[PDB]
């Protein structure tokens with residue numbers, strides 16, 4: 001089946017992130033960790049990838065976002081640049097949605113698409129269909145209604161799960177992203 005046990009890849013995690021020992025949770029830290037500057041690590045934003053690689057097929061997982069004022073979720077090319085600043089955008093190899101400012105939900109098209117969610121999600125489901133070129137996001141709190149779907153994605157290599165528990169803002173958004181047991 002499509003359900004997949006996601007774990008986080010510590011080698012990609014920006015130093016502002018704290019990963020749980022089981023690598024199923026991630027949160028913003030109050031200070032930067034001292035860790036290596038290996039090529040895989042995102043150096044400019046608090047992001048981290050799942051360890052799993054997708055080359056084909058259908059895949060699904062869920063993330064708890066309860067009570068966070070900001071976060072970003074989805075999938076990206078393994079080949080996306082890790083160093084420096086960039087746009088979280090389908091044009092750049094990212095298929096993501098995000099919340100910021102407590103109630104601004106957007107999809108990472110470029111230009112960005114504003115999202116209008118009648119029921120703020122406490123848990124989000126991400127569905128990847130490699131062959132169909134689709135990444136879809138579901139509001140678990142709202143009985144699995146569709147938040148947004150990217151279609152006509154032109155996948156060419158391995159894809160990775162993508163996660164950010166927020167950006168650095170002074171330590172208000174400390175709660176973790178948690179991968180849900182499926």
Ligand SMILES: C[C@H](O)c1ccc2c(c1)N(CCCN(C)C)c1ccccc1S2
Nearest residue numbers: 070071072086087088098099164166167
């Ligand atoms: C600008 C570029 O696309 C970019 C790079 C890195 C991040 C974000 C955007 N945001 C989205 C902000 C969209 N509007 C507001 C510009 C974000 C949102 C939620 C959690 C982490 C992040 S980190």
